Amino acid sequence: GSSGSSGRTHTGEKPYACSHCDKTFRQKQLLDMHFKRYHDPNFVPAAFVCSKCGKTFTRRNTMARHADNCAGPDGVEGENSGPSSG
C-alpha cells in the first residue's frame, strides 16, 4: 500500500520522545502540544461533543453551529477497542 495509503495501517515507533517525561509521539506537533499542555497548564485542548448526535468538535463555536444543522445520530455508533502491545 505504497504511494496510496499511509497512516491507516502502519505502526511506526514514535521517533519523538519527550525529554521531560517518558512519553512518545509520531508527529512533533503531538510532542509539541503535549509539553505546553501537561508540563504547562497554559495549552488547553478544545473538547466539545455534540448533544443531538454525539459527535466530536475541536471548536466551541464550530460545534454550536453544527448542532443547528445537526439532525441527529441517525444510527448506533461509538464503540471500538484495540487491546494490543505494539
CA distance 27 to 15: 8
The letter for the amino acid at 77 is E
Instruction: Pick the binder of Zn ion from 9, 10, 12, 20 (CB under 5 A).
Output: 20
Q: Closer to Zn ion at the Cβ: 23 or 26? A: 23
CB closer to Zn ion, 33 vs 50 = 50
Three-state DSSP at 31 gives helix
Binding flag, residue 53, Zn ion (CB under 5 A) = yes
Region from 7-15, 45-53, 56-64, 76-84 binding Zn ion, contact rule CB under 5 A:
45-53
The single residue among 28, 36, 52, 59 that binds Zn ion, judged by CB under 5 A, is 52
SS3 53: coil
Toward Zn ion, which CB reaches closer, 26 or 55? 55
Rg over alpha carbons for the chain, rounded to the nearest Å, is: 17
In whole angstroms, what is the distance from residue 57 CA to residue 46 CA?
Answer: 8
